[PDB]
Design a protein around this ligand. Structure first.
Ligand SMILES: CC(C)N(Cc1ccccc1OCCCCCC(=O)O)C(=O)c1ccc(-c2ccoc2)cc1
Ligand SMILES: CCCCCCCO[C@@H]1O[C@H](CO)[C@@H](O)[C@H](O)[C@H]1O
Ligand SMILES: [K+]
Length: 271
């Protein structure tokens, strides 16, 4: 009974996932391993290739629309910020496609997203990352980790920890059906500050976590300790976002010429 209902519940969350995110992990790994295709990502590894990419690749956000140019490291930061805001929009529609999320009063929906999207983002980021770099422009480019390490502090320092997380997270070998549940549990989190209806959010969270528990038994039958490992990963993500916010505060304080998107400004006010 319990296992039956939770199976259907998981499927609806998976559909919400497949319906709203621009790239699946299945698609990402196929590009990053070059398994299939006639097209390979253009590799961005230094200044010259970054420029060739802005001259050639199609970006969701127009280069001319980014805040005025300042310098290479900042430009990269602007592209990171564009993609973050675009992922916030996707996560908002994903959450909204979950009926128990949409049933919450809108103010609770905002609180969950405000305190949850960065955790979800850095979890999902692992899908487009390997040890050597990550996909950009809807899979049309691949920016190398080494290049990103070469940017000046503080922009190199805010990037590398996410790769450290992602490589360890990818070793658990989750698929998109696992991630849908996992991301749903990050967003529907009853611990978030200022929540109005905590018990309702806690109950939803618990339902998702039980659904995920049973999902991993069927989908990863030989993986021992995988469910508790993922609970630790959720705790790990909180710490990763604490550090990230700390670094963002330092960027606000010391990089005054660097523009921060207003939506992310609204996200950081309280952390
Ligand atoms: C996490 C995702 C959203 N992301 C950013 C990103 C990846 C890994 C580590 C850090 C990082 O962003 C730290 C800044 C955060 C911003 C503001 C905020 O905190 O909301 C990216 O997908 C991305 C996009 C474009 C590029 C790029 C383009 C040309 O050269 C490089 C590199 C990455
Ligand atoms: C699109 C979902 C993500 C939204 C993230 C930003 C949330 O910002 C918050 O919006 C509230 C008004 O609604 C204000 O009361 C808070 O002061 C502000 O911090
Ligand atoms: K990897």
């Amino acid at each position: 009974p319990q296992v039956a209902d939770l199976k259907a519940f998981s499927k609806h969350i998976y559909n919400a996932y497949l319906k709203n995110f621009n790239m699946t992990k299945k698609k990402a790994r196929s590009i990053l391993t070059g398994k299939a295709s006639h097209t390979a990502p253009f590799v961005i590894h230094d200044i010259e290739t970054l420029w060739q990419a802005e001259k050639g690749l199609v970006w969701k956000q127009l280069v001319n629309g980014l805040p005025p140019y300042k310098e290479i490291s900042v430009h990269v930061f602007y592209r990171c910020q564009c993609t973050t805001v675009e992922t916030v929009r996707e996560l908002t529609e994903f959450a909204k496609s979950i009926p128990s999320f949409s049933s919450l009063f809108l103010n609770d929906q905002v609180t969950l997203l405000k305190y949850g999207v960065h955790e979800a983002i850095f979890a999902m980021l692992a899908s487009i990352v390997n040890k050597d770099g990550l996909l950009v422009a809807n899979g049309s480019g691949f920016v190398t980790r080494e290049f990103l390490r070469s940017l000046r502090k503080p922009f190199s320092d805010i990037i590398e920890p996410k790769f450290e997380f992602a490589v360890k997270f990818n070793a658990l070998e989750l698929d998109d059906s696992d991630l849908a549940l996992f991301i749903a549990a990050i967003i529907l989190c009853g611990d978030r500050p200022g929540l109005m209806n905590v018990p309702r959010v806690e109950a939803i969270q618990d339902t998702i976590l039980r659904a995920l528990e049973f999902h991993l038994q069927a989908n990863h039958p030989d993986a021992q300790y995988l469910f508790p490992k993922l609970l630790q990963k959720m705790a790990d993500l909180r710490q990763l976002v604490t550090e990230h916010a700390q670094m963002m505060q330092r960027i606000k304080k010391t990089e005054t010429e660097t523009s921060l998107h207003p939506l992310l400004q609204e996200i950081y006010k309280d952390m």
